[PDB]
Amino acid sequence: DNVITRVVAVRNVSVRELSPLLRQLIDNAGAGNVVHYDPANIILITGRAAV
Amino acid sequence: DNVITRVVAVRNVSVRELSPLLRQLIDNAGAGNVVHYDPANIILITGRAAVVNRLAEIIKRVDQAGNREIEVVELGNASAAEMVRIVDALNKLVADERTNSILISGDPKVRDRLKRLIRQLDVEMASKGNNRVVYLK
Amino acid sequence: VNRLAEIIKRVDQAGNREIEVVELGNASAAEMVRIVDALNKLVADERTNSILISGDPKVRDRLKRLIRQLDVEMASKGNNRVVYLK
C-alpha cells in the first residue's frame, strides 16, 4: 500500500491513448495517483504500488 | 511549515501541462503558494516546504519522467557523419573528426542505446584491400 | 513592495540568463557551434579562439561542460606522411 511513482515506456504509440482507462484505475481505487504521459514518449505513475 | 520558493526543472515538455493538478496541491492545503512555469522551461514554487515539496514531487515527476542529457564518445574508425546518416533512418546526433568522436543530443535512453551504437560500429575496418599490386609472372 | 519583488524576483531567479567566454585553443568554434546546433545559443572568436555563450547559467553549467569536453588532444592526424623509398 506504499505510495511510489513508476516511470516506464511504451515505445509503440503515444500513451495519451490510455488516459481514460488508466484514470479508470485512478477511479477503480483511491486517488493521490498521477499518470502523466510525456510527449517525449515515456510514462509516469504515482500512488499505491498495487494500483 | 516554513514558506520557501523552490526552482526545479522539467526538461521534457512545457510544465504549463501541470497547472491544474499543481493548483490542486495549491488547493489541497493552505494558499500563499505560487507555481509559475517559465517559457524558458524551468519551474517556480513558493509556500510551505511540505506542499512545495509535494508540488516539486509531481513537478520532478515530470522532470525525471522525460530527462535529457548528452554524450561524447570517440569513433576511431567509422565516419561520424556516416554514423549520423545510418542512425538518421532510425525514428539526435553529432561528432567531431578533429577527435573522431560521436556526440549525442537526447535521452539517457538515447545515452543507453547510443552508447550501444557508440560500441556497435567501432570494430575492425575489415582490411578492404581496395587496391592490390599483382606481380606479373 | 518587498513581497511583490519576491514573486517578481521569483520569476527573475526562475529563468535568469548570463553569458560565458571560454578559450577553444583547438576545435574550430564555428564547428563547436555547428555540433552544438544539433542540440535543441553560441559564439566564439578565432582572434582569441574562445567559445562565447548566449543563454542560461544552466547553459553556463552544461556549456562549460562542453567548453571542457572538446578541448583535448588533436590526436596527431598525420594527414600527410613522407615515405622514404627503400
C-alpha–C-alpha distance, residues C13 and B128, integer Å: 58
- CATH number of the domain that B104 lies in? 3.30.1370.120
CA distance B74 to B79: 11
- Measured CA to CA, the distance from residue A47 to residue A29 in angstroms comes to 11
Contacts of residue C72, Cβ cutoff 8 Å, sequence gap at least 6: B99, C26
β pairing state of C50-53 and C42-45: antiparallel
C26-59: burial string, b at 16+ Cβ within 10 Å, e else: ebbbebbeebbebbeebbbeeeeebbbbebbebb
| Phi-psi region at B79: left, alpha or beta (left = phi > 0; alpha = psi -120 to 50) | beta
Q: Are B87 and B54 in contact (CB under 8 A)?
A: no
Q: What are phi and psi of B75, to 5 degrees?
A: -115, 90
Shared domain check, B84 and B41 = no
Enclosing domain of residue A18:
1-51
User: Experimental method for this entry?
Assistant: cryo-EM
- Report the distance separating Cα B12 and Cα B7, nearest Å: 16
Which chains would you list as touching A if contact means 3+ CB atom pairs under 8 Å? B
Q: Which three cell numbers stand for residue A20?
A: 481514460
Q: Do chains A and C touch (3 or more CB pairs under 8 A)?
A: no
Count of other CB atoms within 10 angstroms of residue C11: 12
Same domain? For B112 and B75 the reply is: yes
Nearest CA to B70 out of B42, B88, B95, B98 is that of B95
Same domain for B77 and B51?
Answer: no
Whether residues B58 and B40 fall in one domain: yes
| C11 Cα to chain B: minimum distance (Å) | 7
Task: With beta carbons under 8 A apart, name residues in chain B contacting A44.
Answer: 61-62, 65
Q: How many domains does chain A have?
A: 1
In total, chain B counts a number of residues equal to 137
Are residue B24 and residue B81 in the same domain, yes or no? Answer: no
A33 touches A51 (CB < 8 A)? yes
Q: Does C4 touch chain B (CB under 8 A)?
A: no
Residue B15 to residue A23: CA distance in whole angstroms: 20
Residue B105 φ/ψ, nearest 5 degrees: -125, 105
DSSP type of residue A39: T
Q: For residues B64 and B56, give the distance between their C-alpha atoms in angstroms, rounded to a whole number.
A: 11
What is the Cα–Cα distance from B31 to B14, expressed in whole angstroms?
24
Contact assignment for C14 to B42 by CB distance below 8 Å: yes
Sign of the dihedral defined by the CA atoms of residues B9, B10, B11, B13, in that order: negative
Contact A38 B62 (CB under 8 A): yes
Q: Do C39 and B101 touch (CB under 8 A)?
A: no
